[PDB]
Copies of this chain bind each other. A is one copy, B any other.
Amino acid sequence: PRILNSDGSSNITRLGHYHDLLTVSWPVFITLITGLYLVTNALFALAYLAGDVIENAFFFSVQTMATIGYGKLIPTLVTLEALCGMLGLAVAASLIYARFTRPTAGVLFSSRMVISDFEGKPTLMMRLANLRIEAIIEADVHLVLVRSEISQEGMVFRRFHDLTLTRSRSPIFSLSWTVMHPIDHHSPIYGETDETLRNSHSEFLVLFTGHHEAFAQNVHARHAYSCDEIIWGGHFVDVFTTLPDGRRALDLGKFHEIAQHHHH
């Protein structure tokens, strides 16, 4: 089967949580505090009852934790709860900001890779697209081959080759980017064929990072391919157009399109 899924996640099981709050969906986060919020008040409401030091307990609890202080219920450790309410809000605000600043890239990866000549040399290719109007600055991309290898002797392990790209870094990335690994004699897949790639159970990982100007935050994206997601002889279709207006356009509708010469 597959070590990597398309989204670049691994299926390796591991035998051996602020992050969970950070990761969980927006709806669930509110719920999770809302709960913590009610509960903490139940704590104090029962802490008062245990007595009657308050004129005229759950609702009084929140009135003093939120610092509403209506007044109809004058106290007496309210002071304690006022501390807790303020740290609660401070803690709350931190998580909010961390969640807001979690990296997030709208980078589209091509559904396939191709191997075809480029500048007269066979080249492994794939392409990326920036899905947002704002540019990504100082972008960098890696293409990694992961593949089963063994010594002349029986030992079996998975190799990790970081492949050489004609352009791994780019100061700016705004539209589309075809990433290219020329398969010369230094290439790990030099001389390789469709059949020999399957045998090595070999796979490809794409990793992307850059900085948005779109937000004061960094971004990451990754994607993975199996060897049967490579189109030999294929070529990515141009996604750039000239409109009737005479103006240049990017058509992402053609982004996954690949041309192939069909033999008889």
Which residues of A are in contact with B by a Cβ distance under 8 Å?
A: 1, 3, 10-16, 18-19, 22, 30, 33-34, 37-38, 41, 59, 62-64, 66-72, 74-76, 78-79, 82-83, 85-98, 100-103, 131-134, 137-138, 142, 144, 157-158, 162, 170-172, 174-175, 205, 207, 209, 211, 213-218, 220, 222, 238, 240-241, 243, 246-253
Q: Give Cα A211 to B218, complex, Å.
A: 10
Known contacts A69-B71, A92-B87, A247-B13; A76 and B100 CB within 8 A of each other = no
Contact present for A13 and B248 (CB under 8 Å): yes
- How many chain copies? 4
Listed residue (A94, A103, A144) with the most chain B CB atoms within 10 angstroms of its CB: A94
Q: Is the interface of A mostly helix, strand, loop or mixed?
A: mixed
Q: Give Cα A211 to B140, complex, Å.
A: 14
Contact present for A209 and B251 (CB under 8 Å): no
Partner of A101 from the list B3, B13, B216, B252 (CB cut-off 8 Å) is: B216
Q: Give Cα A253 to B98, complex, Å.
A: 33
